């Protein structure tokens, strides 16, 4: 009973795994009575992410009404409060809408993320890996600019707007997570940036020669007469700008913390470079940037003797499931000839950007291990606030050639 009260943030934040452990041995599923259900075991986690009895129409759910009443506080700007009720082009939706949007978007997205763009991912990774030896904070000087540079290039942001995009990208990044520890002027400041980047994205799309890249390809995509509207194109641009920022930056920070804590596993990478991909999957497993994915039951349901009611919110603990996805799951091992993970979700909503995040993370680690013999981060680590995401706020790293 005192286990439930334990998720979250009484510096459950700083280390949640032993508590995730308690959950799996004792209380695999429970009503949070903050509001939602909480799910901790690999098998049910997979099961719920995959099932067509669970969806993501979050704006039309009672969940935020409930959360807000419980918190006694107004919702901060959040992806999927959508824009004006319409959370749809944010993929916080179910078939047949999600199906239509996913198909059109992923067709353009892949064409903008092929091995032709690889050189610029490497360039961004190596610059960042290089910045690490003369930075004060690896979060704001290295992890956060790397995905901003990459996405700017994927999207075809013109040279002149790079400064504008990077500023927007900064205000919007926290709109991925829920955080009720956000003053007013900052909600506003962040709201303006949702509005201004949607304004800008429309205009770039309707205005022919957007450079080669995603904005332009989102315009050209056509599946037998079917095609994205211009508000769909701009909302998708924003979704992609938010989706790929803090997930990627948190993971760069967490990767760093993890090789600091396990110097031998790093040694393995620098000495065995054929394991670079397996190591990335392992970081993402051991320290995922998102500890939860969310679902809404579309139907009264049974998931392992638990009784879920139409319209209940279900919090899927990706971070917990992962710790039992492989044998000895509490050991960080980059040599796992395996790497089963929930960090990208499963089923129809499987992270669309996951080949790109993997590419980014792999080039980053490859440059990292080729450039440096050791990395050490100063302990203890301060983590960003928020409900579902986990990664460091600041980071001091010592590095050696
Ligand atoms: C950095 C590592 C990343 C992780 C750990 C991550 C994780 C996620 C997770 C947990 C979801 C929810 C999946 C579910 O509900 O089952 C998601 C969805 C999504 N992600 Fe990411 N992501 C990452 C990087 C990216 C990047 C770089 C992009 C874009 C460039 C991206 C674009 C999206 C999109 C568009 C969706 C919605 C998919 C849908 O509903 O069909 N992801 N990803
Ligand atoms: C998934 C979801 C809507 C969860 C809850 O409603 C709110 C919550 C506590 C979120 C924390 C982080 C979060 C939104 C995680 C899953 C997820 C990620 C990582 N990226 C996305 C990108 C685009 C669209 C949806 C998601 C998503 O749901």
From TrEMBL:
The family database entries (InterPro entries) matched by this protein are listed as: Cyt_P450, Cyt_P450_B, Cyt_P450_sf
UniProt-recorded Gene Ontology molecular function terms: heme binding; iron ion binding; monooxygenase activity; oxidoreductase activity, acting on paired donors, with incorporation or reduction of molecular oxygen
Q: Spell out the Pfam families in the cross-references.
A: p450 (PF00067)
Keywords, comma-separated and alphabetical = Heme, Iron, Metal-binding, Monooxygenase, Oxidoreductase
Q: Which residues cross the membrane?
A: none
Query: Where is heme b annotated to bind?
Result: 56, 98, 102, 295, 349, 351
Name recorded for this polypeptide: Cytochrome P450
Q: Can you name the source organism?
A: Rhodococcus erythropolis (Arthrobacter picolinophilus)
Q: What is the lineage of its organism?
A: Bacteria, Bacillati, Actinomycetota, Actinomycetes, Mycobacteriales
């Amino acid at each position: 009973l005192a286990l439930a009260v334990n998720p979250f943030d009484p510096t459950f934040k700083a280390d949640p795994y032993p508590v995730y452990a308690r959950l799996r041995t004792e209380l695999p599923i429970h009503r949070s009575a903050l509001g939602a259900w909480i799910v901790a075991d690999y098998t049910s986690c997979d099961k719920v992410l995959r099932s067509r009895l669970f969806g993501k129409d979050f704006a039309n759910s009672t969940f935020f009404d409930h959360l807000t009443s419980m918190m006694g506080e107004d919702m901060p700007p959040f992806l999927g409060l959508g824009i004006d009720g319409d959370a749809r082009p944010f993929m916080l939706t179910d078939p047949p809408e999600h199906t239509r949007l996913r198909g059109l978007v992923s067709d353009a997205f892949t064409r903008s993320t092929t091995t032709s763009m690889d050189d610029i991912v490497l360039s961004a990774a190596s610059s960042a890996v290089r910045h690490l030896e003369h930075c004060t904070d690896a979060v704001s000087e290295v992890a956060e600019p790397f995905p901003v540079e990459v996405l700017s290039s994927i999207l075809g942001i013109p040279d002149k707007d790079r400064g504008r995009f990077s500023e927007w990208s900064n205000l919007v990044a926290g709109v991925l997570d829920i955080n009720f520890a956000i003053p007013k002027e900052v909600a506003d400041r962040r709201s303006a940036a949702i509005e201004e980047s949607i304004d800008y994205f429309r205009t770039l799309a309707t205005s022919g020669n957007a450079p080669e890249g995603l904005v332009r390809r989102l315009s050209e995509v056509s599946h037998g007469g079917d095609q994205l509207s211009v508000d769909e194109i701009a909302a998708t641009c924003l979704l992609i700008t938010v989706a790929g920022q803090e997930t990627t930056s948190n993971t760069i920070g967490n990767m760093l913390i993890t090789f600091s804590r396990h110097a031998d596993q790093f040694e393995q990478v620098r000495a065995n470079p054929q394991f670079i991909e397996n190591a990335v999957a392992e970081v993402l497993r051991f320290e995922p940037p998102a500890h939860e994915a969310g679902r809404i039951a579309l139907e009264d349901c049974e998931v392992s003797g638990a009784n879920i009611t139409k319209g209940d919110a279900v919090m899927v603990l990706l971070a917990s499931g992962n710790r039992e996805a492989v044998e000895r799951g509490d050991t960080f091992s980059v040599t796992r000839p395996d790497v089963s993970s929930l960090s990208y979700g499963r089923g129809i909503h499987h992270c669309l950007g996951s080949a790109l995040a993997n590419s980014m993370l792999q080039h980053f680690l490859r440059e990292l291990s080729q450039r440096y013999r050791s990395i050490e981060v100063a302990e203890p680590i301060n983590y960003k606030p928020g409900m579902g995401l986990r990664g460091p706020e600041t980071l001091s790293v010592a590095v050696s050639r």
